[PDB]
Design a protein around this ligand. Sequence first.
Ligand SMILES: O=C(Nc1ccccc1)C(=O)N[C@@H]1O[C@H](CO)[C@@H](O)[C@H](O)[C@H]1O
Ligand SMILES: O=C(Nc1ccccc1)C(=O)N[C@@H]1O[C@H](CO)[C@@H](O)[C@H](O)[C@H]1O
Length: 813
Amino acid sequence: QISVRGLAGVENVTELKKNFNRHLHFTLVKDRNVATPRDYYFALAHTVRDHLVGRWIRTQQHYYEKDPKRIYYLSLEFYMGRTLQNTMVNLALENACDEATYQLGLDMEELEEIEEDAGLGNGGLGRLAACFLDSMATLGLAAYGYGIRYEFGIFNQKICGGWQMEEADDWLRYGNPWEKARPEFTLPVHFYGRVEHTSQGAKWVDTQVVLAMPYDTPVPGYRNNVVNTMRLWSAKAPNDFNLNVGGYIQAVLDRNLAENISRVLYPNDNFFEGKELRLKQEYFVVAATLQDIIRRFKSSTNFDAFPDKVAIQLNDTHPSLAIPELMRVLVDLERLDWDKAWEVTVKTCAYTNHTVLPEALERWPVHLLETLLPRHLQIIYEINQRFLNRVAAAFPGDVDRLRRMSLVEEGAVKRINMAHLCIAGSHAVNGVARIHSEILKKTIFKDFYELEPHKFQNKTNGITPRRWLVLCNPGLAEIIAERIGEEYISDLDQLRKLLSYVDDEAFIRDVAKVKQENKLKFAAYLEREYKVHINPNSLFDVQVKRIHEYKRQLLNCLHVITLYNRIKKEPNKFVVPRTVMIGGKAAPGYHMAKMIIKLITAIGDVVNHDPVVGDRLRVIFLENYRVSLAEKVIPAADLSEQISTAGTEASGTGNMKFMLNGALTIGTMDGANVEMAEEAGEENFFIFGMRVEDVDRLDQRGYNAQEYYDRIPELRQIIEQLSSGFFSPKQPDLFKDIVNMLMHHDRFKVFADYEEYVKCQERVSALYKNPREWTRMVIRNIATSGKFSSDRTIAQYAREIWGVEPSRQRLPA
Ligand SMILES: O=C(Nc1ccccc1)C(=O)N[C@@H]1O[C@H](CO)[C@@H](O)[C@H](O)[C@H]1O
Ligand SMILES: O=C(Nc1ccccc1)C(=O)N[C@@H]1O[C@H](CO)[C@@H](O)[C@H](O)[C@H]1O
């Protein structure tokens, strides 16, 4: 149908059809008379997966022959989403499969909807890892993603009576056609035990063993025949585990305890919970991964070359135990001297920070590490002692610096600061957007920057244009390709060529047509699967991201209520119709976040049923926001809400997805919004509110929310409506906690940005009244979105941290 989706050759289509029928028969053990839609999905997945095998085997043998430096990306989260369409896109198989299935009497899009998301992440950090894997393969890097194969991913969100309910994400129930179990590469991981000091070195003894079984998933590069590996570990009890009939049976049942390690993803976004099971998960991935790395390195004794052949990237502090684990193996097992082992470790490891919120930073109680990982604790103490001796030599007499920089935090319970460990043990430390990286050097890691300035870098985040343009918005990808060709898909900077089309009447019409079609398609999705009715001609105002106070969904809520109150005051006055869509999951134990969701639905309940409002304002909570839903709503959006308090959103990546897909942005100068505005021009961005400096000034003075309440009559009305039970008639005090927080303990200064936000939103509505000028500004955004390709980001990691050169060169098919 459309060019960017590839060729549908006679030979290919015939071969796809016959292999589809072969799998339906031999693999699924079905015929066409009994086959269900799910059977058809699986037959297709197997048909496509067959095309990966040859390339996968030859990519890995190529790495064996050439022996390039290997990149190991360690993460507790990989938010992959669906794999079928992505695989077809990267293999140029989409049109061929579409044709083949069409001739078999099947709709491929319908089959694609059957696949479960691989929801092995919470949000931004997990999705970044996924985009990164795609870019690393597309850039021909010898890269491996290493993580955990959770049996249960991020929970499925159900909304019941306006409240979030959680249910287990049983994503493996029907099987996963995209993984290959590798039970022959199973490795032991050790826990507990004790440290024994012998004549020659320390020994870690009397441990309990859990097995780590790897599952490999292919990661195809974009049309370069490269297929890299994501290896995810699953926990397995050894056969003699816990080994009378009651006794025998119980011993077998108790194997569950060991296997619980990989059972479920911790559902916290930007928060630290010091649970033993989480620590076990963190060590489990680290221990199994490092053994795999060392084994592969030896199959190339001399560890001087280790950093020349290995890079380990730590996705935040979650796999920070890689540092003392590498030291443990090098010192205790390989018998290297401390100083050499340390040199190797530092040159191998690099650390990426993803948040400055203090509650999110990992600080593990010493007593936990003492029991679970006694040898690692000893190594951490030794690292700390040697590190502090260095600090003391550089800043003599600065006793407070010593305590501030210590890996060991004193207090009620002694804790290890994992971020401090990571900085000490890495040759590179980076933030994820220019403003964030500057904040790291100026505030939370200031002491470390002063000691080792060369270590600190920036690597602004990005998104893959494959999933986030070609896959989810083929219509836009096509109208761009018609003008500037196809090369932009792996060279997004080429989108700048679209600037010469900003006055092109045909292109303006095409951009606007593509958006309208996307909005119609999404409006049809909402009716079919949720029976909700929306005006497709209205401005699609969307805020999708995890529910957190710093992201300020509440500020959005305040604007929504302002609009409703204004309509009610002057009903027969024209307003630009809006569909306000808010979606995202709340962490199960985050009360305030759960209250915010209830508020959103409560506002919708009132607004959506007021006859005076009509089709002029609609408020919808998008249930179960996840990668597959993002691929649907983002292409349909007109306005992207990126309204975090300045200095709180490290980067954001949802922002980039919207920019690439033809939405305009209303946002604070926070995270990557700053660079987005810089790329597009501030005239082409709806910027409002406090900058970081303004927040700092307010903090010095003290933030008094009452001041705003007293001086803004429209804000007073909203608070009074909330408190009185206007939005909860049967439970008048339902939102008392929200009001109290806003008035008395608001860390994120919702009121301080209220006036500027509402004013800015009026300017959005004004522009939307002029479709031609709206679209022209959209073109200016898409055209300057190139910087935010994860290909750019990965190329920078490669050259500036890993010391490897990216390549767009094809491997033979
Ligand atoms: O090939 C497989 N997965 C794969 C292949 C290519 C790309 C992505 C995933 C796979 O899972 N094969 C399974 O191996 C089992 C033995 O190890 C067989 O019993 C299964 O029938 C087969 O599906
Ligand atoms: O810190 C994060 N997650 C987390 C933190 C602790 C425990 C589990 C997950 C996180 O997701 N941070 C986000 O990283 C994104 C990718 O760099 C950024 O775009 C976001 O700004 C940041 O909040």
